[PDB]
Design a protein around this ligand. Sequence first.
Ligand SMILES: N=C(N)N1CCCCC1
Lengths: 10, 239
Amino acid sequence: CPARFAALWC
Amino acid sequence: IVGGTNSSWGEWPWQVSLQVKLTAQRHLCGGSLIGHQWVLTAAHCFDGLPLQDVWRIYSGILNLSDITKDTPFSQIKEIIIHQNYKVSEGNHDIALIKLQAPLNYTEFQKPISLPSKGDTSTIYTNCWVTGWGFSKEKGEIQNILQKVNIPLVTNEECQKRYQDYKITQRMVCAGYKEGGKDACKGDSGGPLVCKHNGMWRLVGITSWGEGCARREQPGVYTKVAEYMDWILEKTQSSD
Ligand SMILES: N=C(N)N1CCCCC1
């Protein structure tokens, strides 16, 4: 997942 | 949640904690109970995950440090990720989870109401975002469920802060120009709920934003009303 998303390893 | 406060019992009875256990157990994402056997969350919560046996879903829990070995939890029977979700793109960030057993409803474990298809969010003036995510960038998971009051912003104003992403009609944005209040890491998939005439409904699913609580960088949420045909079709077809 891209950095703009909120999961822990995005 | 940045700039929020501690919630009390029964305020957000639809909020769940989606956790995994491999050798250790950790909170990964939020979700909303929408039916006796259905949780609604974000598709990106499944990116980089093993198969679904790892998941433990906690409902009727206010405080994650109150969880023990004997605290009951739900397990996953089915994961339905939106067919058109692609991770690098980020559109249709929505997923259904079917639980292995239906939950009995209590004052601390109840479903959130859903909007109608065709809903303009202009009537929602009192909206809240909840979760156990970081309270700052480069922060840590919070123990007591946090709540914060955030205004919705129009898609036109949201789009100005985000080149080069397209803010579509299927998204809804919320934030302060001055920042300081926002969702953050660990809040993914949780509810954006608005109270209208005494009742709460799910308006958005926590999805993305730049960092957390930055000035002029609103949080972006999947607009639930724009997926109500999908939600109804998938839950009926499964059931
Ligand atoms: N609203 C913000 N800032 N988010 C959404 C959840 C993932 C991290 C960023």
